[PDB]
Amino acid sequence: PLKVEKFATANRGNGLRAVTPLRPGELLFRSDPLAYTVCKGSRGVVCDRCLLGKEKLMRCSQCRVAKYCSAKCQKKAWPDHKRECKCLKSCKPRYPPDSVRLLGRVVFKLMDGAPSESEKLYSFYDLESNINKLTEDRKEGLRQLVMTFQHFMREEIQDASQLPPAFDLFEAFAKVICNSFTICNAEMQEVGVGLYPSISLLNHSCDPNCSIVFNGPHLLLRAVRDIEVGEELTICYLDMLMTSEERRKQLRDQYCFECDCFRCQTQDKDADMLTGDEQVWKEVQESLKKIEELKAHWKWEQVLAMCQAIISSNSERLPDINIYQLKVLDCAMDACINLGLLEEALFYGTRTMEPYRIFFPGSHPVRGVQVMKVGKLQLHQGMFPQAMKNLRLAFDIMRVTHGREHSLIEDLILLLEECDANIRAS
Ligand SMILES: C[S@@+](CC[C@H](N)C(=O)[O-])C[C@H]1O[C@@H](n2cnc3c(N)ncnc32)[C@H](O)[C@@H]1O
Numbered sequence: 024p025l026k027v028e029k030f031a032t033a034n035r036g037n038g039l040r041a042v043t044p045l046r047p048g049e050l051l052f053r054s055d056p057l058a059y060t061v062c063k064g065s066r067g068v069v070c071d072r073c074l075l076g077k078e079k080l081m082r083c084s085q086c087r088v089a090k091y092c093s094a095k096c097q098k099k100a101w102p103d104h105k106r107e108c109k110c111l112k113s114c115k116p117r118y119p120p121d122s123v124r125l126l127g128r129v130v131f132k133l134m135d136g137a138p139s140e141s142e143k144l145y146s147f148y149d150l151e152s153n154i155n156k157l158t159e160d161r162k163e164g165l166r167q168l169v170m171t172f173q174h175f176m177r178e179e180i181q182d183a184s185q186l187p188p189a190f191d192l193f194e195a196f197a198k199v200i201c202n203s204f205t206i207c208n209a210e211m212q213e214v215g216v217g218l219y220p221s222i223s224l225l226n227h228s229c230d231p232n233c234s235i236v237f238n239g240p241h242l243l244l245r246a247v248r249d250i251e252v253g254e255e256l257t258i259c260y261l262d263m264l265m266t267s268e269e270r271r272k273q274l275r276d277q278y279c280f281e282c283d284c285f286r287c288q289t290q291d292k293d294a295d296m297l298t299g300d301e302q303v304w305k306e307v308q309e310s311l312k313k314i315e316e317l318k319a320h321w322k323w324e325q326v327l328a329m330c331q332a333i334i335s336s337n338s339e340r341l342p343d344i345n346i347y348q349l350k351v352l353d354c355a356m357d358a359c360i361n362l363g364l365l366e367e368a369l370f371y372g373t374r375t376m377e378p379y380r381i382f383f384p385g386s387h388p389v390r391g392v393q394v395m396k397v398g399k400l401q402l403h404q405g406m407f408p409q410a411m412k413n414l415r416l417a418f419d420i421m422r423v424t425h426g427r428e429h430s431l432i433e434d435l436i437l438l439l440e441e442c443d444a445n446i447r448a449s
Pocket residue numbers: 034035036037038149150151153201202223224225226227228277278279280281282283
C-alpha cells in the first residue's frame with residue numbers, strides 16, 4: 024500500500040505527506056521517468072537509454088544523434104526515439120536545448136504511450152506552472168522555447184490535433200522549468216534530465232526529511248529522518264554547497280518562491296562557507312564556471328589543470344571549508360580518479376572529508392558517495408584499517424540514502440567484504 028499521499032498544503036500548493044510512520048532508509052516511492060534525455064555535456068559520452076558511460080558508443084544510423092552502449096539499448100530505445108529521430112535529422116546541424124528535446128518526448132509519450140506509472144500520484148497535466156509569478160523576462164524566454172519546439176518538431180507535429188487535448192506549449196515549458204529533475208549517475212555526475220510527475224509533489228526544504236537518488240533513469244525516494252503520520256515530506260531541490268543568498272536566487276528564479284525555513288532565516292552556515300580572503304574566493308567562484316563547464320563535458324585533463332592552478336597556486340589560497348575551494352577539490356578528485364591518478368585523487372578526496380561532514384548533515388547521498396570513493400582509493404592503496412572505517416561510514420549513510428534497491432550498495436558490499444578479508448588475513 025502507499026506510505027505516502029498527496030494533500031493540499033496551507034501555503035505551498037500541493038504536497039506529499041506520510042500515511043504511516045517512516046524510519047530513515049525506508050523506501051517511499053520509486054519511478055521511471057515520464058520522459059528523459061541525456062544532457063548537453065554527456066551527449067555522445069553516455070548511453071541515451073541507460074545513461075552509463077562507454078569508451079565507444081553506437082550511433083543511430085538515421086539521425087546519428089542518439090548514441091547507445093549496446094544493440095539491446097538501441098533497440099529498446101527505438102519506440103521512444105522513433106519520432107524524435109526524424110526531427111533531430113531534419114534539423115541536422117542544430118541541436119535543441121535539453122528542455123525542448125525533453126518536452127518532445129513528453130508529447131510523444133502522452134500521445135502514443137499507455138498511461139505511465141510515473142503519473143500515478145500526480146500527472147504532467149497537474150504540474151505547477153507558476154505562470155502568475157513569472158517575470159516578463161522569464162515569459163520572453165518561454166516564448167522563445169515554444170518557437171524552438173515548433174521549429175524542431177515540425178516534421179512530427181504540425182497542428183494541435185497532434186498534441187494532447189488543450190495542450191498549451193507555453194504552459195508546458197513553464198511546468199518544465201520548475202519540475203525538471205537532474206539525473207545523476209552512480210558517481211553523482213549529472214548525465215540527464217527527466218520528468219517524474221509523482222515525485223514533483225514533494226516540496227523543498229533546505230533541511231529535508233527525504234532524499235532522492237538515481238540508478239540510471241530510475242528514481243528512488245527514501246526517508247532520511249524519522250517522519251510522523253501526517254508530516255509533510257520534503258527534499259532539497261538544491262546543491263548543499265550554496266549560501267542562503269545563492270539559494271534565494273535559484274528558488275526565486277527557477278521555482279518562484281521565498282524560503283521561510285530556519286536555515287534561511289538565520290543564514291545557517293553561510294559564514295563558515297565563505298571563510299578566507301574574499302578577493303581570492305571571488306576569483307575561484309568565477310573560475311568554477313569554466314571548470315564546471317569542462318567537467319559537464321567530461322574533459323578531465325582540462326578540469327585537473329585548472330583545479331591544480333588553484334589548489335597549488337603560487338598566490339593566496341583558501342581554507343578547504345570554503346565552498347568554492349571545496350568544489351575545486353571535488354572536481355580535482357573526480358578528474359584524478361577518471362585519469363588514473365589515484366594517489367593525487369586520495370589527497371584531494373581526504374581533504375574534502377571534514378567539510379563534507381559539516382555541510383551534508385545526517386544522511387545525504389552525495390556524502391555517502393564521496394566517502395565511498397575515498398574508502399575505495401584507500402583500499403586499493405593498501406590502507407586497510409582506514410579504508411574499512413570509511414567504507415563502513417559510507418555504508419551507514421548509503422543504507423539510508425541508496426538502499427538495497429540501488430545497485431551501488433551491492434558494489435559497496437563487495438568492497439566491504441574485500442577489505443574485511445584483508446584485515447582477517449592478519
Ligand atoms: C516540484 S513542485 C512541488 C509541488 C507543488 N507545490 C505543486 O503544487 O505541484 C515545485 C513548486 O512547489 C512550490 N514550493 C515548493 N517548495 C516550496 C516551499 N518550501 N515553500 C513554498 N513554496 C514551495 C513552488 O511553487 C515550486 O515552484
